[PDB]
Design a protein around this ligand. Structure first.
Ligand code: ADP
Ligand code: MG
Length: 276
C-alpha cells in the first residue's frame, strides 16, 4: 500500500519528543484542523534491499495493517499515516502519562492490588488482540503507556506494534526476536511462535510488578537468554515474602517452557488470583 504523501507539516505541528527506538522517533503533535493531539511515530525507511539500516517496507506495512484493525480501550489506535522518501509517519493515539517502565522506576514498590490493577488491563488488551489472532511479540514496560500517571490506579494502553503478527496458522516462523529479559524460550531457541509467547512475557511483567526485580536478568544478554531457555528463576523471599501464594501460582503457570502447557489468555482471566 502507499500512504499520504503531502508534507505532514502542512497538517500537523510537532512538539515534545515522547520516546524513541533504534529506527523510530515519536513526537507529540497537534492536528491543525481540529486542535487534537497525537503521537507521531516516524519510522526510518530502508534505503536499499540489502540494507540492515531502517525498517523494511514489509515490516512497516505489517505494523500499519495491525494498527488499522484494532480498537479497544487498552490498545492505541491509528489516526492517519503519511510518508516521504525517508520515513513513514504513523499518527497514533497519544498516551500522555509516560511509560509503565518510568512509572515503576519513580514509584515505591507496588501493592498486590496496584499490580493487579495494571495486570488486569494488560490482560484485557491482550485478550482483545489474541481474539483477533494478533500476537504482540514485544510486551514489556516500555511498551505500555499510562493515560495519566497522577491518579491512584492509572489506566493503560499497549503500544509498539513493531513486532506484532497475525497468527493465521497457529504459529509463525519469521525473524522475530525482542528483548532478552522478556522473550519466551521459543524465541530464544528460534522456534515457530504463536500467541503463547505473549503469555510468557506477561508472566515476566507480573513478576516485575510485584517485586521490582526481573526474573531472568543476568549480567549480559547471553546470560539472560540462557536463563530464559533453562527457566532459571525463583521467587526470592526478600522480595516476595508478603506476596500471596496465589500470585506466585499465577506467575508459575505462565513461566512454563512448553508453550502447550502454559496458561492461555483465557486461562489467565479465569485464574483465581484474577477472577472475581
Ligand atoms: N502512542 C504513543 N503515545 C505516547 N508515547 C508513545 C506512543 N507510541 C510510542 N511512544 C513512545 O515512544 C517510544 C518508542 O515507540 P515504539 O512504538 O515503542 O517504537 P520502537 O519499536 O522503536 O520501540 C515508546 O517506548 C514510548 O515512550
Ligand atoms: Mg518500543
Amino acid at each position: 500500500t502507499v500512504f499520504r504523501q503531502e508534507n505532514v507539516d502542512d497538517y500537523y505541528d510537532t512538539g515534545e519528543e515522547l520516546g524513541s527506538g533504534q529506527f523510530a522517533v515519536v513526537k507529540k503533535c497537534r492536528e491543525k484542523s481540529t486542535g487534537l493531539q497525537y503521537a507521531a511515530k516516524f519510522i526510518k525507511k530502508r534505503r536499499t534491499k540489502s540494507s540492515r539500516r531502517g525498517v523494511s517496507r514489509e515490516d512497516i506495512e505489517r505494523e500499519v495493517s495491525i494498527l488499522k484493525e484494532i480498537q479497544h480501550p487498552n490498545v492505541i489506535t491509528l489516526h492517519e499515516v503519511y510518508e516521504n522518501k525517508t520515513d513513514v509517519i504513523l499518527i497514533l493515539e497519544l498516551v500522555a502519562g509516560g511509560e509503565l517502565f518510568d512509572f515503576l522506576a519513580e514509584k515505591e514498590s507496588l501493592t498486590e492490588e496496584e499490580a493487579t490493577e495494571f495486570l488486569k488491563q494488560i490482560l484485557n488488551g491482550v485478550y482483545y488482540l489474541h481474539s483477533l489472532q494478533i500476537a504482540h511479540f514485544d510486551l514489556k514496560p516500555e511498551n505500555i503507556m499510562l493515560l495519566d500517571r497522577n491518579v491512584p490506579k492509572p489506566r493503560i494502553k499497549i503500544i509498539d506494534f513493531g513486532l506484532a503478527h497475525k497468527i493465521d496458522f497457529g504459529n509463525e516462523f519469521k525473524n522475530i526476536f525482542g528483548t532478552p529479559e522478556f522473550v519466551a524460550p521459543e524465541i530464544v531457541n528460534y522456534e515457530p511462535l504463536g500467541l503463547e509467547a505473549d503469555m510468557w512475557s506477561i508472566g515476566v511483567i507480573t513478576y516485575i510488578l510485584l517485586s521490582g526485580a526481573s526474573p531472568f536478568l543476568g549480567d549480559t544478554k547471553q546470560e539472560t537468554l540462557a536463563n530464559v531457555s533453562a527457566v532459571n528463576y525463583e521467587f526470592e523471599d526478600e522480595y516476595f515474602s508478603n506476596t500471596s501464594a496465589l500470585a506466585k501460582d499465577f506467575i508459575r503457570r505462565l513461566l512454563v517452557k512448553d508453550p502447550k502447557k502454559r496458561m492461555t489468555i483465557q486461562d489467565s482471566l479465569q485464574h483465581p488470583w484474577i477472577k472475581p
